[PDB]
Symmetry: D2
Amino acid sequence: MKHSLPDLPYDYGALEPHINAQIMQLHHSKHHAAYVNNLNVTEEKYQEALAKGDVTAQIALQPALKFNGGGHINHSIFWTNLSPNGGGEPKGELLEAIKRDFGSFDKFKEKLTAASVGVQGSGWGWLGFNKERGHLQIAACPNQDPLQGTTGLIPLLGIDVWEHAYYLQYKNVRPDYLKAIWNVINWENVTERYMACKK
Amino acid sequence: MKHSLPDLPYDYGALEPHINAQIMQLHHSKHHAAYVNNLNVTEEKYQEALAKGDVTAQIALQPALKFNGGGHINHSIFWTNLSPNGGGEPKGELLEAIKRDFGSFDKFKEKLTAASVGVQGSGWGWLGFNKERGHLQIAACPNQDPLQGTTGLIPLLGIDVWEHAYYLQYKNVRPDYLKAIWNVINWENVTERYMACKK
Amino acid sequence: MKHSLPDLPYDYGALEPHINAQIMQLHHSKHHAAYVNNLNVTEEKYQEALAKGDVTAQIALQPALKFNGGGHINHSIFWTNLSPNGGGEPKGELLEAIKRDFGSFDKFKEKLTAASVGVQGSGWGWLGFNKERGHLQIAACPNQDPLQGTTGLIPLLGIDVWEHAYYLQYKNVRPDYLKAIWNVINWENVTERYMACKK
Amino acid sequence: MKHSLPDLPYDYGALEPHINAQIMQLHHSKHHAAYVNNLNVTEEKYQEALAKGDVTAQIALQPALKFNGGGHINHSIFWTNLSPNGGGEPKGELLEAIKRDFGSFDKFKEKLTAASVGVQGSGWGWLGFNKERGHLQIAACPNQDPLQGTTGLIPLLGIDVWEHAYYLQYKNVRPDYLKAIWNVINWENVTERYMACKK
Ligand SMILES: [K+]
Ligand SMILES: [K+]
Ligand SMILES: [K+]
Ligand SMILES: [K+]
Ligand SMILES: [Mn+2]
Ligand SMILES: [Mn+2]
Ligand SMILES: [Mn+2]
Ligand SMILES: [Mn+2]
């Protein structure tokens, strides 16, 4: 089997004025596309190296596998985490978990914003679920290091803070992007991911 | 003493069409400015922590010091490494060193381009001088990790491959930026840095 | 200030048979002593670099500062975390927190053992307190990276899993060391550290 | 394929008094054996993950693959780099390369000793061959990160500076171990590895 670029679940201009059409089109059709293709190339090289017992070759392929693999994992989640129907607050058990674990929805937003603003260089802020503790948890990841593969936490909501995710529109002012993105968070999707972790 | 933002040695539009005016203005007046200011803040916090023997506080400040400090170091070099009078090939002893160490000027360009294109996420490609071996050396650095502070190599020529260095103009196509930047390399400056390493 | 090697709170053979006297003597009088001495040297170099605005020099000193500084921080806590009168289970609010956060004392032991066994290369397992969440948390740290300086978690109980902490007695069998050390945990000290986090 | 633990090319006590028999026996029959066994387990898990397109699982397996795989790579080279008939200086083209690249054999020894002493935590010092530059190069690697897999340099001579490589005999005094090991370097093997890089 081969990994493929998932279609975007909405039109490229559906998240304006929060994230512009040019960004969405580049981000999906150029950036994610590249990760998917380079992941498939890397996986094939890895299969050859594994079959030959070439451990040196396997290890040389790790950065490309984590980078492109992580890129595919993260952006596949990210597109579903956004929606033109998004924004506002979550409801039901996710909201209850947020209040219990972070005090309030606004305190939660502050913590995820702070983690996302705090990434030095390229990376991601995440709300995840800690299976072992049975509660929510915030973490930041560098580059395309994916949340579950590197920490064990199950991803619920990711915020891409690579410059490509915002620069054309917001330039250097990452906090303006982080303010805007709250308006398009697909809480339906984040709730679905959360409910799949429980039971 | 306090670190300060060096003036750009040319006008913001001096490197068009290779690097556009909007990029130069943002990169110098917003990005580098931020690094300089946050470096001075970090250094003052470090001086307090040192005076108190607060080792925990010193260690907590390391990421900000490397990031903002490195940002200041790297961009201060980068502005002088470019010029509207740049491009072409170097001459004299630098050219002789390039031919001796890399075979030819074009082979050297291939290696520095490859290191620069190869940065996954944010970072820099460098031509440096290895004092101990007495020859040239190429290295890549992540984020704002500066060359001399992290490797001991003396920086001669740096290529910023953070998305902010090219994205407004070249979008995702980093190789187009790397082709363009060869036209504005200030070989006079790179030669001056090289000659200061010898003797 | 000049950092100093804290006196051990018991004699070198007080933790026998669980950690032998030769290990305790080497670990305190050679390993920790070296961290203290090299920390003082590094801090003086940093003071000179700061006074000169030498950011390159500050950054070059970071590995020595984190390693020796972290070494001092970690081992100063570690000695107080152990006692000849230790072992068994904690009581009062710490025990209540352990049961609440990890299910039971035995489940907690399993998780901290697993984190400590899981360190590949040199490092530490920690029980810490997350100030922001107001609960207990287990984390692992590489090398001498200290818990609070690198994660913000307040250290309560640390387990050194550098080979020097066990190798003379247990050789490669780190799990035997981790089983043994439970017999000398100073729960009085861990409780004091925990109570200082609350209120 | 199933990786296997290579036989040692001499008996466990053949490198006495420089590295004692207990160390060699533990290092080969326990440490390297564990890397081989855990590598085979990890490779099988990776084959399942690859067949399923489970990229998360592939990425979660990277630390075990690099650690155990790197451990296998590094120690397989290390055993052949030592010999009871070793020590003294190399001859022929390797000696000429050492003199050309480092000034002299004694200056080379100083640099490889310094790189090996300089490892903070667990790792290796290496003399390698840079294929691209066509000359010798010294590098250090953390943990079990292997030289060729992580840097592209071809390994010629490795020095293990994990505490398990010396602690039973030399305790904390790593420099005494590094002085001793020069007496058992198998220059015949290092020459064979060097000659395979050329032509
Ligand atoms: K629209
Ligand atoms: K907007
Ligand atoms: K112009
Ligand atoms: K152009
Ligand atoms: Mn992205
Ligand atoms: Mn920049
Ligand atoms: Mn220790
Ligand atoms: Mn070893």
